[PDB]
Symmetry: D2
């Protein structure tokens, strides 16, 4: 059956939700770009830890037990939240940056040359 | 002035665009979850490299020269693209996972206790 | 005056980690990609110690005992898995470093 | 039979990297968070070598000369910055590893 993401939240929605979250706790002061980047690195580490002893040939994440699927959802989400916060703190329009990068990707890797 | 992301593309839009990109090049075969995760780690490295010698107290990424802003947009985008691909390859509904993680974040960090 | 202790050497660490793994029948888990992902995990744990540190507050030489203990452990975890990974790949890590430092001097002349 | 060379030791690497940095007046750039981010960069370069490697194709012992050269360099880059970071933090990395291995034995009894 086709796998799709839900239509919401959008990246702007996530930015907005995280900013409201941080602002309520007076955490803006901690959200300097290098702080957010190191926090991102920490969550990428937590993501890697889930996969480190999983063989490639055995069943994949669809088959993991419920607690491990929950942990996977959480870590993928933590990476995304910090990425969004970082992009916003740097005044980068992340959705449009992705459009521009995908165009660059198509030129670097034209279909006929692969 | 308020900083906002553009309303599109959405995360579903990005998933769709990346899948079409990969499928055209017969790259699905390379997109196993640990491959995508290691590729993500590589792009997080490229992102870190931009910041490694930047002092925190000096002007931030808004002030970087055009070539460095371009590189920043690209690396933030490459991290996001692989994160999206990874989440999709694991059948994780990334937007809804983020909603669930933000709820968890609010319980762990109630406003009155910070 | 700050120095590292003269032992263990990287070969000593290789030997100790191999014996640790072999006793537990863990060689089967220590494939290069598994060790690399484990390394990435520990790099994350290291980053976590620094992520919220302001410029004005004390630097790691001055960190309280609990935080210095955690720092020693994470720097050590990164090193142990790096050693294991290099050994699993049959890379002579000490000599590779000498070769890399020479390359670094050419890339970065004074 | 696979062994690392007996030298350089971690103290030897510390010394060599400090002299490399000091000659170029780079101490000012080698603050702990800068070194940690640089380390993360090199971990990324290491990951890139493995990212598209299938299970069936040759493992790193068997990699062609160009790829083995790249592997040696990235493992070395990770180690050099890890050493620099530990030294900048006044952490006795060799002895920290001994302490961490003891902790590992208690956490993971047979
Ligand atoms: N200053 C902070 C601290 C947390 N957060 C948010 C962002 C993340 O989604 C999440 C990461 O913080 P966290 O304390 O590491 N919780 P996490 O669920 O990763 O559990 P552990 O790291 O304790 O295993 O809370 C934030 O936006 N700003
Ligand atoms: N198998 C692949 C290879 C690339 N891609 C896409 C995803 C990324 O946005 C981007 C990353 O691949 P890339 O070759 O590293 N280009 P990048 O712009 O990062 O430049 P360099 O790493 O060469 O500096 O192309 C993909 O989806 N699947
Ligand atoms: N399968 C394993 C498990 C542990 N180890 C060793 C290597 C590391 O020095 C350390 C990493 O294992 P670990 O369980 O993640 N301990 P850690 O100190 O990082 O505490 P956590 O916070 O991760 O629970 O033990 C190993 O070499 N192979
Ligand atoms: N400011 C610096 C620059 C380089 N170095 C040393 C440490 C590393 O072993 C290595 C990293 O610098 P580098 O320019 O990233 N070289 P690298 O071999 O990784 O090639 P690139 O692919 O990154 O251009 O030189 C340093 O210690 N301090
Ligand atoms: Mg966390
Ligand atoms: Mg987390
Ligand atoms: Mg790249
Ligand atoms: Mg890139
Ligand atoms: Mg650990
Ligand atoms: Mg650890
Ligand atoms: Mg480099
Ligand atoms: Mg390198």
């Amino acid at each position: 059956m086709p796998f799709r993401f839900s239509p919401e939240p959008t990246l702007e929605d996530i930015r907005r939700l995280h900013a409201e979250f941080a602002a309520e706790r007076d955490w803006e002061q901690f959200h300097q770009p290098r702080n957010l980047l190191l926090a991102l690195v920490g969550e990428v580490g937590e993501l890697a830890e889930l996969f480190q002893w999983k063989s490639d040939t055995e069943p994949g994440p669809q088959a993991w037990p419920p607690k491990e699927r929950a942990a996977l959802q959480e870590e993928l989400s933590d990476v995304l939240i910090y990425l969004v916060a970082l992009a916003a703190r740097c005044h980068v329009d992340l959705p449009q940056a992705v459009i521009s990068k995908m165009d660059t990707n198509r030129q670097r890797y034209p279909v006929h040359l692969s």
